[PDB]
Structure formats: C-alpha cells, structure tokens
C-alpha cells in the first residue's frame, strides 16, 4: 500500500490507499497510490 507503485484503483471498486491519496488517469487500467 502507498507510493506510486501499488494497486489502488484497479477497476474503481471503491479504491482507497492507506496514505489517503491515489492517482488514476483515464487511460491505464489499474490506478496506483500517490503520496504527494
């Protein structure tokens, strides 16, 4: 969990990262976490 290299929003099933911040662009399938 956490960091720009971990699953967070693969298919929008209420995606949420422990950090409390994520990142998903309208292109890639699975959105990864984000710290800042």
Curated annotation (Swiss-Prot):
Transmembrane segments: none
Protein's UniProt keywords contain Cytoplasm: no
PROSITE patterns according to UniProt: PLANT_C6_AMP
Disulfide pairings: 1-18, 8-22, 17-33
Annotated coiled-coil segments of the chain: none
GO BP annotations listed: defense response to fungus; killing of cells of another organism
Primary localization: secreted
Subcellular location: Secreted
Family as reported in the entry's similarity comment: Belongs to the AMP family.
Task of the protein: Has antifungal activity against C.glabrata.
Entry remark concerning the domains of this protein: The presence of a 'disulfide through disulfide knot' structurally defines this protein as a knottin.
Name under which the protein is recorded: Antimicrobial peptide Alo-3
Protein's organism: Acrocinus longimanus
């Amino acid at each position: 969990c956490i960091k720009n290299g971990n699953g967070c929003q693969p298919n929008g099933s209420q995606g949420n990262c422990c950090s409390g911040y994520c990142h998903k662009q309208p292109g890639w399938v699975a959105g990864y976490c984000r710290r800042k």
